[PDB]
Amino acid sequence: VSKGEELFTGVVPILVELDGDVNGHKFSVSGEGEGDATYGKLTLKFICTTGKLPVPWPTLVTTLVQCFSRYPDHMKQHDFFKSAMPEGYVQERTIFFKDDGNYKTRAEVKFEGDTLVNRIELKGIDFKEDGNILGHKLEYNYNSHNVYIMADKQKNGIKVNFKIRHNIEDGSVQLADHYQQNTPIGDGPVLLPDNHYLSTQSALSKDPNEKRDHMVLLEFVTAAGITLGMD
Amino acid sequence: GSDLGKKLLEAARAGQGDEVRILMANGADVNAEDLHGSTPLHLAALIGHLEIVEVLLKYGADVNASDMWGNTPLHLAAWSGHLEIVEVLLKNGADVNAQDKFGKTAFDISIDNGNEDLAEILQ
Structure with a gap:
């Protein structure tokens, strides 16, 4: 039930650009590939x-295109992300690494010609020099999560929250609380959702021919309704 | 896939029946996989392309191929409510008890999507 969902019926090229500063360490990330929202x-x-990424690749996954979530037919009305396209949306987050610092992020996600582009600024402060993040103590892997979404009538968008679980190499888990807001860039009408969630799965790998510091990411995300005996 | 494998995955996902048929006749691997472990049959089932589903099965596609997320072609056909494709997959030995990583069968998906027609045949 949006003209925007028509842009995602096929496989779509993706470009990601991130400018970062964590505790004063400046870095940039480029990303490319494809999404299949069906x-x-x-x-x-x-x-x-x-050069070398000064934080662990897994800490950046969430920052580095929720318009690629599969929304089933019965739920197409709750798909804010695609409805804002092609003009796109602004995605902001604060991410609290428990017992450690935080990331603040601001991203614009929109089409440029036929490519879906995520451009991000990231500022991280108050990290411990030998905590799990600046100490590079996270395992190179990723967990599955539930991403909770509600409408925000006021800002003509959505609010979103979830907790990421990052495996630590000593067997412990480092939590990252994620608070999120999304606002459309265009003046066009958008879909404001009933409360629901995205169920996420990810795998991280290395390209054996790639000589730079890098991350290969495979991700699979499905939208779901709240069901009886949740909360 | 390989060279032909990659073209076959792309042609299947794009719903290009003739291109799929020519690729198969020229020896493409019917069970080519992308990095997620998606096969041509997964992709055709996803988009509801009956012709490509039948052509691939006729060239010996694994009806019960699983991607790295535990999805089978039957799951993906059910995701989109593709009744005829479900019938064809079932008739070619699709596994009604295959579970994805959430523990769900194709039946469970039909139930989540409230689809009474699919639920009836996926039991």
């Missing part, structure tokens, strides 16, 4: 263009 799939590869 399947709910991303296939992406990201490069640190400034």
Whole structure:
């Protein structure tokens, strides 16, 4: 029930650009690949263009295109992300790494010609020099999560929250609380959803021919309704 | 896939029946996979392309191929309510008890999507 969902019926090329500063360490990431929103799939590869990434690749996954979530037919009315396209939306987050610092992010996600582009600014402060993040103590892997979405009539968008679980190499888990807002860029009408969630799955790998600091990301995301005996 | 494998995955996802048929006649691997472990049959089932589903099965596609997320072609056909494709997959030995990583069968998906027609035949 949006002209925007028509742009996602096929496989769509993706470009990601991130400018970052964590505790003063400046870095940049470029990413490219493809998304298949009917399947709910991303296939992406990201490069640190400034040298060595000064934080663990997994801390950046959430920042580095929820318009690729598979929304089933019965739920097409609750798909804010696609409805804002092609003019797009602004995605902002604060991410609290428990017992450690935080990331603030601001991203514009929109079409440029036939490519879906996520451009991000990231500022991280108050990290411990030898915590799990600046100490590079996160395992190179990723968990499955539920991403909770509600409408925000006021801002003509959505609010979103979830908790990421990052495996630590000693067997513990580092939580990252995620608070999120999305606002359309265009003046066009958008879909404001009933409360629902996205169920996410991800795998991280390395390209054996890639000589730079990098991450290959495969992701599979499905939207779901709230059901009886949740909360 | 390979060279032909990649063209076959792309042609199947794009719903190009003639292109799929020519690729298969020229020896493409019917079970080529992308990085997610998606096969041509997965992709055709997803988009509801009956012709490509039947052509691929006729060239020996694995009816019960699983992607890295545990989805089978039957799951993906059910995701989109493709009744005739479900019938064809079932008739070619699709596994009604295959579970994805959420523990769900194709029946469970039909139930989540409130689809009474699919629910009836996926039991």
